């Protein structure tokens, strides 16, 4: 299983992670869909970035193959603590961070609580500001296992559905039913789900204080997180750029891979 | 005067233009401010693009050093005819087009009337859709000569005013008072100026038919053309990408030169 990488104790949690490349460190933070893992989200991103940077992609506690501590208390602050624990564990003093949706919200929160540890940020279809729960997100977080449910979820993420094959739906369905996966997932964002969007968000006041050069990326047709959310982040973050891909859903790193990789690498190269 | 380049008869008008580089042709269309010329707008853009493309930057009839025909009838269609006349004159069968504001509106109009002659487009703080005249635009089009008026206009275009020096204001003021310049300029967009924004615009219906890969660029703080205008173009053009620079005014090619040049060259390189 290529989704399983190396293991390291971080913030007291046995964490699964990938580490490829050398030089300036870049932390990639995955999303929060069912069966999600750092590898699943960034497999097409790591190879490109690792040619110029040291890429670290860990499975956040409660997701992927990282340990799911009994009676663990999941929260924005706990996840931020996990990220910092991972950086501490790897002696990563300061790094750029790329966050996908859920991970984007965590990226913002980490930059606010540990400004000295974060350099540049890339927020992709990111959480971080309050927006009304969409039908797509409620369907994603409300997922129950079945190949048809997974095919439909994948369709929600994609603009070009031809990319959603029976095989992909089957593989992700299988990933979603691994021991303990659906159990922790279903209890992670229970109804009413608007509560979690609000909890993962940072205040406009706090976001305005961010000094980090930031690159906001979004897919015009994103059905999970509305484009309006990134437009708002773009009005709040001072040193920011916004790049919106037309004919692209939530999966920007997957549907516009080459354009995404080029933009991100050049963005970091500026430093 | 480096703003004066070569001369060629196009659509019956003696046209001043610059031609640098080899390979795939790219036409750069300047804006409509006082004293504007292809060189003034694109001097920092041509050198970068000319390393990979043949860059053509002409002075549109009624602007720069191109002839200003007596009793000439200026209009969106006449300007489109000038662009096509320039391409015909240079045996440019198909080319990418980069349009700045006014020029962006012309780029869209040319792509609609001569789809076969236009490949990829880059619309920067472009006209093309209807928007309520801004105080900045009315001040620009309502310019009367003086170094103080020019300094203020330059400030309207810029985010970082430290870039507006007495010397630059002096040089552009001098450019604006060249024989016949202010005369044709003041009669070009007379009050009420909303009429000209509407005339230069293309209908939502027509814009939706554009098949061209398009790159829309805008400065968050643009005081002349509102960001909302580009957001709208981005909702209308199918194969489009939107890139918004924070801490950037109307002068994107001038204030974010390297980022702008890289994005444009890579955009064209995809073809």
Automatic annotation (TrEMBL), chains A, B:
Keyword Transmembrane helix: no
Short name of one Pfam family: Abhydrolase_1
Keyword entries, A-Z: Hydrolase
InterPro entries: AB_hydrolase_1 (IPR000073), AB_hydrolase_fold (IPR029058), AB_hydrolase_sf (IPR050266), Epox_hydrolase-like (IPR000639)
Coiled coil: none
Active site: 101 (nucleophile, proton donor/acceptor), 250 (proton donor/acceptor)
Domain AB hydrolase-1: 25-255
SUPFAM superfamilies: alpha/beta-Hydrolases
A single MF term (Gene Ontology): hydrolase activity
GO CC annotation: membrane
Record bears the keyword Hydrolase: yes
Protein name in UniProt: 2-hydroxy-6-oxo-7-methylocta-2,4-dienoate hydrolase
Organism of this sequence: Pseudomonas fluorescens
